[PDB]
Enzyme design. Structure first.
Site, PDB file in Angstrom:
ATOM      1  N   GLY A   1     -11.420  31.294  72.331  1.00  0.00           N
ATOM      2  CA  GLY A   1     -12.224  31.647  72.909  1.00  0.00           C
ATOM      3  C   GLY A   1     -13.604  31.918  72.294  1.00  0.00           C
ATOM      4  O   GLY A   1     -13.560  31.432  71.131  1.00  0.00           O
ATOM      5  N   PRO A   2     -14.245  33.394  72.937  1.00  0.00           N
ATOM      6  CA  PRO A   2     -15.851  33.721  71.614  1.00  0.00           C
ATOM      7  C   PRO A   2     -15.544  34.457  70.808  1.00  0.00           C
ATOM      8  O   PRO A   2     -14.553  34.894  70.408  1.00  0.00           O
ATOM      9  CB  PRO A   2     -16.566  34.337  72.909  1.00  0.00           C
ATOM     10  N   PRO A   3     -16.191  34.169  69.150  1.00  0.00           N
ATOM     11  CA  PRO A   3     -16.469  34.669  68.924  1.00  0.00           C
ATOM     12  C   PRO A   3     -16.155  36.223  68.601  1.00  0.00           C
ATOM     13  O   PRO A   3     -17.602  36.655  69.354  1.00  0.00           O
ATOM     14  CB  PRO A   3     -17.268  34.037  67.703  1.00  0.00           C
TER      15      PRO A   3
ATOM     16  N   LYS B  67      -9.512  37.378  67.334  1.00  0.00           N
ATOM     17  CA  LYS B  67      -8.248  37.518  67.362  1.00  0.00           C
ATOM     18  C   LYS B  67      -7.420  37.420  66.265  1.00  0.00           C
ATOM     19  O   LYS B  67      -6.448  37.115  66.522  1.00  0.00           O
ATOM     20  CB  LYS B  67      -8.809  36.059  67.458  1.00  0.00           C
ATOM     21  N   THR B  68      -8.182  37.367  65.637  1.00  0.00           N
ATOM     22  CA  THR B  68      -7.853  37.769  64.440  1.00  0.00           C
ATOM     23  C   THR B  68      -6.079  39.646  64.542  1.00  0.00           C
ATOM     24  O   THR B  68      -5.691  39.441  63.902  1.00  0.00           O
ATOM     25  CB  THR B  68      -7.814  38.292  62.844  1.00  0.00           C
TER      26      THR B  68
ATOM     27  N   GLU C 230     -46.702  42.076  84.041  1.00  0.00           N
ATOM     28  CA  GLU C 230     -45.329  42.728  84.324  1.00  0.00           C
ATOM     29  C   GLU C 230     -45.311  42.902  85.524  1.00  0.00           C
ATOM     30  O   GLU C 230     -44.509  42.755  86.580  1.00  0.00           O
ATOM     31  CB  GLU C 230     -45.031  43.761  82.828  1.00  0.00           C
TER      32      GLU C 230
END
Lengths: 478, 441
Positions: free
Chosen positions: A52-54, A58-59, A274
Site C-alpha cells: 500500500g501507500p507509505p 504497515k509496521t 479567480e
C-alpha cells in the site's frame, strides 16, 4: 539481537482497519487454533504481504498483529542485508531465521523488501551478487528444506511489481493484502485514535475535517493531529474546536498563508482570474460545487485558487464523458477569456499562462486518447497527412472551447463585476455568499439532459416505432 | 543567510547549551563510528535537558539515493541511527533538534515525514529593510563616515546574503586601508561594489581603437533606446545608471541598469515586453545606423535574446491570439546575471515553466517561425527608425563615452536634452571637442 521487547500494540491501537482486520485476526487464529488446522490437513501459510501507500503504518499493523498473537516479535530493516561485503548478509539471514526457529512460536517482520527483493539481472555489480545471495538464502530458509512449521513471516512493501516472482510463489508469499488509503470513516477513526491522548471537546465534529482532507494517508492525519496543538496559543482560547482543524488542513494541503505588499491593480487581476475560473466552473456539471474562493497568495502560488470537490469515483475508474473534458478546457481557457474581455486583446497578461497550457495539453490528450470523432477515435495512422491532421483537431477543439469561454463570460458581466468587487474587498469568499451573488445576478443555464432522460426518450421512441411496425404488419396482413 | 547564526541566537536567548557539529563531521572511512558519534551527541543532549542539537549541512549525511566504496554504507547507517534516535525521542523532555541544509531536493523524504522533522522553515534572502538592518549591524564594527548612505546600497544590491554584506563592509575597510583613509567613504564603498559585482579594473589592457568603438556604440545605443523609450512612450522598463568600456572581470565593456520592484515583475504585458525587446535590439540598431551596413559580432548575444523572447511571447505565453498547441524549450540557456540587460522580468528569460510538449504537426512550426520573423523584423525597423531619427545624441554620447571611458545616466540625459531630434550632425561636428562634457555632476 533482532528481538524487540515491550510489544503491547493491539488492534484497538490501530484504526482504519476494515475487513483486513479480519485477515489479521485470521493470522491470530493461525497462531491459536492451528491444532484443528493441521488436524484437517492445512499447512499454515507462512507468507503474508501488506502492500500500500507509505505512511499508512504497515509496521504499526505488524506491532498490532504481534501483540494480539502473543508471540515473539522480530522487526528487521531490509537495508542491513545489502552490503559491500558478500556472505555476511546470508549469515545474518541464517542467524535471524535460526533465532526465530529457536524462539518458536514467533512472528518475524521485514519492511521494504524492494531493497533486497529486486529481480536478479537488473544491476551489474557486486552489490547485485550480494543481493542475489541474500535472496537465495532467505528463499531457502523460507521454503528450501523442511524444519519450519511454526515461524510466520510478515512483510511490508510499497511497489509489488518490483518483487521477484520466485518470492511470490505460494508457500513463500501466498497471502497478499492491500492496505488502501483511508476513505471517509477511516480518516475519522484514525483522527480519533491519534487524538485520544489529548483533551478534546464534545462539539468537535470530525466529519467536516475528514471531508476537507480527502485522499490522504494516515500519517497525514497524524500530522493534522500534530498541527492541532501549536497554533491556538496565538489567540489563547479555551478548548479545541473544528475551526482550528479546518485551518490546519487548509495550511497543510497548500502551505502557510503569508501577506506581502500589493497594489490595487494586482489584486484586481488576481480577482478577475479567480472570478473567471469560478464563474465558468459553476455552470458546468463536473465542477459545479465550488466551496472556497480566495485570492490570497500562498506558498508557491502567488495566485488564488478555486476549490471544488467533484465525484471521485468516475475519475479514478475512467468514466468521464467527452463533454466533461471540453468543459474543463473551457474552464482553463476562461482566465484568458476574462483578461481579453476586460483589458482588451492588445493587453493580454502572462498570469493565465499556467492554465492556457493545461487546456492545450488536455485537448492534445483528448484527441489522441481515442475520444474524438474524426473517423472513429483512431489516435494512430501511417501516412504523414493523417498524422498532421491529428494535431489539427486539438487546435480546433481549443478554438471552440475558446469561443465558448468568450460567450459564457460575456453573458455574465454584471455578476462578474460584483464578484470581482467582493473578492477585492474581502480577499476571500465561501460557498454561501458566492452562490448568493450567483443567484442574485446569474443568467440562464439550461442543463443538458443526463443519460437517464436520453435512455427513457430512446426507449419510448423504440417502443412506439416497434408497435408501429407491429400494426403495419398486422392490419396489412389481417 | 545565517541559519547557524539563527540557531545560535535561539540558544542564546533561550539560555540553553548549544551543540554544534556539522554534517561533514559525520563522514569517515571506518564503518559505525558516525552512528556512535550520533548516539554520543544525542545522549549528551539528553544529559542537560532542555538542549538544542544543531547539524550544519545535514544533506552531507542525508544524500538522496539517486538513481540517475564503503562510505555510502556508513552514510546509510548514520541516517538509520539518526532516524531511530529522532523517532524514539519522547516529546516531553524538550530536546529540540535543528537541521540546516542548503538544498531540499537531495534530502531524503523520510526525514520530511512528520514525526522526525515536524517544522520546515525557509530562510529567504533579506529584503531591502533586511539588508538595511544587516548594514546597520555590520557598520557598527568598522569606522563609518556620515557621507555613506546605506539605503541606496541596500536597495541596489538585490538578493545579496548577509555574509555577502559582511564581505562588502570588510572589503570596504580593506580598500580604505589601501587608500589610507581614516574612515569608510562613499567612494570606497562604491569601489567595493564594483570590485565584487563586476570585478577589479585591469591596468592598461585595451584593444585597438576599432575594438572599442563597436562595443561603445552597442552599449550607448542600448542606453539611448532605453532612455528614449522612458522619455517618449513612458515604458515600464529600467533606467540607465552608468555605461563603461573599461575592462572589468571578463567583460570588455558594461552598461549598468537599475533593478525595479518585483511587483511589476509578475504581469508582464505585451507592450512592456515589446519595449524591452526593442531595448534588446538597440545595440544592432546602433551598429546599423552608425556603421551603415557593416555590423559586427559585439551585438550577437542581444540578437539571440531578442529571438528567444519573441518565441516566448509567441509560443510559451501565447500572448498573440492565434492559439498554439505546444511550446518549445530554449535550445540555448544563458543565466540571468549582472549589469547587462535584465532578462529576469518574469523571474527569468531562459526558463520555460514546463510549458513544452513534443510537436506532431510540422506545418504549423513554419507558421510560428514566420510569425516570429515578422515580429522581429517589424520591431527591428521600428527601433532602427526611432534611433536613426536621433543620430546627433547617439554620436555625441559615443564620442563623450570614448573620451571619458565612462558615462553616467544623468550625462546621457543631459546629452539627450541638449541635442533635440532632427538637428544636423554638423552641429556636433563643428564643436571644438565632440568628446567634451560641460556638465559637472
Amino acid at each position: 539481537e533482532y528481538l524487540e521487547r515491550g510489544v503491547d500494540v493491539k488492534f484497538t491501537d490501530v484504526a482504519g482497519l476494515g475487513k483486513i482486520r479480519l485477515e489479521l485476526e485470521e493470522i491470530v487464529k493461525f497462531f491459536t487454533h492451528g491444532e484443528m488446522y493441521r488436524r484437517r490437513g492445512v499447512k499454515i501459510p507462512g507468507g503474508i504481504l501488506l502492500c500500500g501507500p507509505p505512511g499508512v503504518g504497515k509496521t504499526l499493523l505488524a506491532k498490532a498483529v504481534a501483540g494480539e498473537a502473543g508471540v515473539n516479535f522480530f522487526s528487521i530493516s531490509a537495508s542491513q542485508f545489502v552490503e559491500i561485503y558478500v556472505g555476511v548478509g546470508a549469515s545474518r539471514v541464517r542467524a535471524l531465521y535460526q533465532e526465530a526457529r529457536e524462539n518458536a512460536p514467533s512472528v518475524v517482520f521485514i519492511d521494504e523488501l524492494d531493497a533486497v527483493g529486486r529481480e536478479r539481472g537488473l544491476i551489474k555489480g557486486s552489490g547485485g551478487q550480494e543481493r542475489d545471495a541474500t535472496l537465495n538464502q532467505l528463499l531457502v530458509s523460507l521454503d528450501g528444506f523442511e524444519g519450519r512449521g511454526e515461524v510466520i513471516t510478515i512483510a511490508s512493501t510499497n511497489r509489488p511489481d518490483i518483487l521477484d516472482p520466485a518470492l511470490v510463489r505460494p508457500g513463500r508469499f501466498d497471502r497478499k493484502i492491500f492496505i488502501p488509503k483511508p476513505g471517509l470513516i477511516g480518516r475519522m477513526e484514525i483522527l480519533q485514535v491519534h487524538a485520544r491522548k489529548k483533551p478534546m471537546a464534545e462539539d468537535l465534529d470530525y466529519m467536516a475535517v475528514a471531508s476537507m482532507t480527502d485522499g490522504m494517508v494516515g500519517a497525514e492525519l497524524a500530522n493534522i493531529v500534530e498541527i492541532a496543538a501549536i497554533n491556538m496559543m496565538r489567540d489563547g482560547r479555551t478548548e479545541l474546536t473544528t475551526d482550528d482543524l479546518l485551518q490546519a488542513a487548509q495550511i497543510e494541503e497548500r502551505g502557510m498563508l503569508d501577506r506581502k505588499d500589493r497594489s490595487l491593480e494586482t489584486w484586481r487581476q488576481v480577482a478577475i482570474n479567480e472570478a473567471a475560473m469560478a464563474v465558468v466552473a459553476v455552470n458546468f456539471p463536473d465542477m459545479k460545487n465550488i466551496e472556497f474562493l480566495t485570492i490570497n497568495p500562498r506558498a508557491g502560488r502567488e495566485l488564488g485558487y478555486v476549490r471544488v470537490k467533484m465525484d471521485h469515483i468516475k475519475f479514478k475508474e475512467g468514466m468521464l464523458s467527452r463533454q466533461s473534458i471540453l468543459d474543463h478546457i473551457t474552464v482553463q481557457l476562461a482566465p484568458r477569456a476574462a483578461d481579453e474581455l476586460w483589458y482588451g486583446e492588445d493587453q493580454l497578461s502572462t498570469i493565465w499562462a499556467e492554465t492556457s497550457d493545461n487546456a492545450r495539453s488536455a485537448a492534445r490528450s483528448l484527441v489522441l486518447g481515442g475520444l474524438s470523432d474524426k473517423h472513429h477515435g483512431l489516435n494512430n495512422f501511417w501516412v504523414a497527412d493523417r498524422i498532421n491532421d491529428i494535431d489539427v483537431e486539438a487546435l480546433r477543439i481549443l478554438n471552440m472551447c475558446y469561443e465558448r469561454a468568450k460567450e459564457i463570460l460575456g453573458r455574465n458581466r454584471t455578476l462578474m463585476d460584483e464578484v470581482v468587487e467582493k473578492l477585492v474587498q474581502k480577499k476571500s469568499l465561501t460557498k454561501q455568499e458566492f452562490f448568493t451573488l450567483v443567484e442574485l445576478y446569474g443568467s440562464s443555464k439550461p442543463m443538458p439532459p443526463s443519460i437517464l432522460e436520453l435512455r427513457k426518450i430512446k426507449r419510448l421512441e423504440l417502443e412506439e416505432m416497434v408497435l408501429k411496425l407491429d400494426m403495419t404488419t398486422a392490419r396489412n396482413s389481417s | 543567510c545565517g541559519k547557524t547564526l539563527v540557531a545560535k541566537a535561539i540558544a542564546g536567548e533561550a539560555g540553553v547549551p548549544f551543540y554544534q557539529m556539522a554534517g561533514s563531521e559525520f563522514v569517515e572511512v571506518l564503518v559505525g563510528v558516525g552512528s556512535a558519534r550520533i548516539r554520543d551527541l544525542f545522549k549528551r543532549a539528553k544529559v542537560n535537558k532542555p538542549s538544542v542539537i544543531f547539524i550544519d549541512e545535514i544533506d552531507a549525511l542525508a544524500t538522496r539515493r539517486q538513481g540517475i566504496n564503503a562510505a555510502t554504507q556508513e552514510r546509510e547507517t548514520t541516517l538509520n541511527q539518526l532516524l531511530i534516535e529522532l523517532d524514539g525521542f519522547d516529546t516531553g523532555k524538550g530536546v529540540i533538534f535543528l537541521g540546516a541544509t542548503n538544498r531540499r531536493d537531495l534530502l531524503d523524504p523520510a526525514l520530511l515525514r512528520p514525526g522526525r522533522f515536524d517544522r520546515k522553515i525557509r530562510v529567504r534572502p533579506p529584503n531591502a529593510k533586511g539588508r538595511l538592518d544587516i548594514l546597520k549591524i555590520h557598520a557598527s564594527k568598522v569606522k563609518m563616515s556620515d557621507s555613506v548612505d546605506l539605503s541606496s546600497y541596500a536597495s541596489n544590491l538585490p538578493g545579496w546574503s548577509g555574509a555577502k554584506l559582511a564581505q562588502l563592509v570588510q572589503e570596504a575597510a580593506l580598500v580604505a586601508v589601501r587608500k589610507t583613509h581614516n574612515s569608510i567613504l562613499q567612494s570606497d564603498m562604491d569601489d567595493a561594489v564594483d570590485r565584487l559585482t563586476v570585478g577589479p579594473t585591469r591596468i592598461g589592457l585595451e584593444l585597438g581603437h576599432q575594438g572599442q568603438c563597436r562595443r561603445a556604440t552597442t552599449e550607448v545605443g542600448v542606453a539611448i533606446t532605453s532612455h528614449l523609450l522612458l522619455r517618449y512612450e513612458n515604458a515600464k522598463i529600467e533606467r540607465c545608471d552608468r555605461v563603461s568600456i573599461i575592462p572589468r572581470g571578463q567583460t570588455l565593456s558594461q552598461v549598468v541598469f537599475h533593478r525595479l520592484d518585483d511587483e511589476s515583475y509578475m504581469f508582464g504585458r505585451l507592450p512592456q515586453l515589446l519595449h524591452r525587446l526593442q531595448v534588446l535590439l538597440g545595440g544592432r540598431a546602433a551598429e546599423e545606423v552608425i556603421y551603415g551596413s557593416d555590423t559586427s559580432k559585439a551585438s550577437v548575444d542581444y540578437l539571440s535574446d531578442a529571438s528567444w523572447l519573441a518565441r516566448k511571447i509567441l509560443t510559451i505565453w501565447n500572448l498573440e491570439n492565434p492559439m498554439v498547441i505546444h511550446g518549445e524549450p530554449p535550445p540555448w540557456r544563458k543565466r540571468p546575471q549582472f549589469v547587462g540587460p535584465r532578462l529576469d522580468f518574469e523571474g527569468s528569460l531562459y526558463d520555460d515553466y514546463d510549458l513544452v510538449e513534443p510537436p506532431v504537426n510540422f506545418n504549423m512550426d513554419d507558421e510560428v517561425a514566420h510569425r516570429s520573423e515578422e515580429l522581429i523584423s517589424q520591431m527591428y525597423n521600428k527601433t532602427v527608425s526611432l534611433l536613426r531619427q536621433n543620430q546627433t545624441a547617439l554620436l555625441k554620447t559615443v564620442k563623450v563615452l570614448l573620451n571619458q571611458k565612462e558615462i553616467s545616466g544623468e550625462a546621457i540625459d543631459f546629452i539627450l536634452d541638449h541635442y533635440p531630434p532632427q538637428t544636423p550632425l554638423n552641429s556636433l561636428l563643428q564643436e571644438q571637442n565632440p568628446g567634451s562634457l560641460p556638465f559637472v555632476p
